[PDB]
Symmetry: C2
């Protein structure tokens, strides 16, 4: 319900506890974590109409035009009018020039006091070829919001180029209203209950995972990394979705179990802590908004090699269900409460992350950009697509070489198929089968 | 003379005003400016002997073992012992893996209160090939100190490889003794005089150059950049030296004049502010130390197109001669005095830098060295020409900000510079405009 008026300051969210400037690193830089999205537009493009489409898209969503102010010991979010935003134009010749311009564009600092958290550039190569550049800092909005952003941009441009009136569904509630609703629902009791549950669940947990690396762990993390591509065919993904249904779980649980089985071949521990970002949209009005609804949970999973993968999958389902009940407490609070002094050589409470994002005339070709960053030792971000299962494995170059991570992705691809074919075997047998 | 005892606190020298923790940037990080020196050691290397040679350097050179501790609103240098230093050994298979390892290791932080201010990695590739990574923060030692460091490393390694003992010339003084002398060798008057000279010399100057760029200038500098190669034949260098000695100047003056003439084709200002780093080692004792002895001086040149090149050469001689007499006050102090509020769009007090690196001065089973190209993709200035003298001619690169320039424009600028040098060689008394239009015969790139 609307509980926000003009000139009123709203608090933050549980998922807004790690935007980009609440996780500052001294040796890395404030803007090392910016998110840049670039597209190539093909065909006769009404450039002014496309700029107006971006203007209207910014004016439609209030997260793209919200500021952050320091009120004593805490911060508040304020909504600004779309006045001031403008799409910048530049004539660029060649692909290498575009790449160099993008590399120069991404690390430009964003400020908490910025009126707009977005930077839009249209690069004019030819009268028929253009490049659209979208840049934001970390913690602004997630992949769901990105798909909504792109779809609404395309619709509004199509409705505005040929002099028509744009027609898009009205957004029922604002993000600030959602934060206000969560504040009054989650004040002091459920927070304490979830914190106690995570304290008891994550008890007697090692501070770090004894994962074997190619290079010695430095006394301080550099957070420089790369990524390698992982691809799963559509038939294997369909078979995974089928085998997940028979066990009463979802595809995310099966894929997380596969990731846990992958990591047991490089560690001697029996308990693996795998972080995982999960969507928290507990209302019908939130499936359409643009914003950050993602929170991080640690999956404490027993990885004894002698247990059959069915038992592992059931244990993973139970752990996810128990964590899905306690997904409201921010991960930063858990880290600061359970690790008072973080060792600068590794990431707190887990060193491996798994992510699964749900499935989402001019021609559009996305421009891949490698940020060259790694917040964890490993990070799996996989996507659901009509032609299969596509994603990347983000690794740290302090500890790992490229070849080992590529082999890890390949054996993960083999492991998914081996799980599909023979789910009745144990983890040791599964890894032995996937060794070849 | 040595006036320092063990475990005694010492003040900071003038060239130490720019190490890393007094020139931090919020969005760049603490370790964006780390100087990674990497080179390939080819042939049979005694890896443990090489590590012992680096340790002997750390023991010999107290700068590589000095800590920096805050005492109030300043910093002091305390010379720790040689205990603690060790060489990290890693096994790397592949040059792309080496490049990724270098990119990851370079931004690893250094602490002001560390016991040793260098990281040495002997990346093992094959039994007869190695990569020696000497990563240090900015301001630890400079190019001349880099040459001294490399020569002493070679001497120590050649002494320790076989069953011999180290035999190196004894160092009469230490950098702490140099700092004590430098703080003694003024009565609060030299700083005032040099500050007054530099504030009077740069007065009535634009806060930024009106140079033409391919792209519009962003609100904040991204500090990303690239470079293009500059190459000059040996004969052209010899003729340039002949012209310089005929006119009563040096090679640096002629190259700076040529650089200023090149920049006139891309601007409408009648004056140019060009920054340049210079060596300050005013003692025979300091000529073989390891340390930081570089200050940055800015050269102001008039580039009106109706004047002959000889007038520009004379003006360059005058300004360079006057600059070397006032090369003690740090450039950071000049920036603080003359620039109250810096603009994040451009570098302060100058956006073009010209650098002339001083020149650097046989067993069957010796080792070969190949300096790995360390292009960090950083740019502190809009344009940065860095050249050095070699027996094969003149070598260097032209560093440009990627926020403003495409590669083709800077490549055309480099070609125009190399053509203008030859035009100057073959035409002594031409005019600036005539030289520019003669050097423009590049066929539009």
């Amino acid at each position: 319900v609307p509980v926000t008026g003009p000139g009123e300051e709203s608090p933050l969210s549980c998922q807004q506890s790690e935007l980009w400037f609440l996780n500052q690193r001294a040796h890395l830089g404030s803007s090392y974590d910016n998110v840049q999205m670039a597209y190539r537009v093909i065909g006769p493009l009404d450039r002014q109409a496309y700029a107006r489409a971006f203007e209207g898209l910014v004016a439609r969503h209030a997260v793209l035009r919200t500021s952050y102010l320091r009120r004593g010991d805490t911060y508040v979010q304020k909504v600004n009018d779309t006045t001031g935003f403008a799409v910048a134009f530049e004539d660029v010749t060649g692909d290498s020039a575009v790449t160099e311009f993008l590399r120069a564009e991404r690390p430009r600092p964003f400020d908490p006091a910025d009126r707009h958290m977005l930077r839009v550039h249209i690069l004019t190569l030819t009268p028929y070829e253009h490049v659209a550049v979208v840049t934001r800092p970390w913690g602004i909005f997630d992949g769901w919001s990105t798909g909504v952003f792109i779809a609404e941009l395309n619709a509004l441009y199509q409705a505005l180029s040929r002099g028509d009136e744009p027609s898009l569904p009205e957004l029922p509630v604002q993000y600030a209203d959602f934060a206000h609703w969560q504040r009054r629902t989650f004040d002091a009791d459920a927070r304490a209950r979830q914190q106690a549950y995570w304290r008891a669940q994550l008890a007697d947990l090692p501070s770090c995972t004894a994962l074997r690396t190619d290079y010695r762990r430095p006394e301080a993390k550099s957070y420089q990394g790369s990524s390698v591509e992982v691809n799963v065919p559509a038939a294997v993904l369909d078979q995974l979705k089928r085998v997940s249904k028979e066990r009463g779980g979802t595809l995310y649980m099966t894929l997380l179990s596969a990731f846990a089985t992958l990591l047991g071949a490089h560690t001697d521990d029996r308990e693996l802590a795998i972080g995982s970002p999960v969507t928290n949209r507990p209302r019908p009005e939130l499936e359409r908004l643009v914003g950050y609804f993602i929170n991080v949970l640690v999956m404490r999973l027993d990885v004894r090699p002698e247990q059959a993968f069915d038992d592992l999958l059931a244990q993973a389902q139970r752990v996810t269900a128990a964590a899905h009940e306690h997904k409201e407490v921010p991960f930063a609070d858990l880290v600061r409460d359970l690790v008072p002094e973080p060792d600068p050589a590794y990431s707190p409470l887990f060193q491996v992350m798994f992510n699964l994002v749900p499935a989402v005339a001019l021609g559009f070709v996305p421009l891949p950009t490698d940020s060259g960053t790694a917040k964890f030792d490993l990070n799996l971000v996989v996507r659901e697509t009509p032609d299969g299962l596509r994603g990347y494995l983000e690794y740290s170059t302090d500890l790992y070489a490229r070849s080992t991570v590529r082999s890890m992705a390949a054996t993960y691809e083999r492991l998914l198929l081996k799980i599909v074919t023979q789910p009745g075997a144990s983890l040791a047998r599964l890894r032995e089968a996937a060794a070849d």
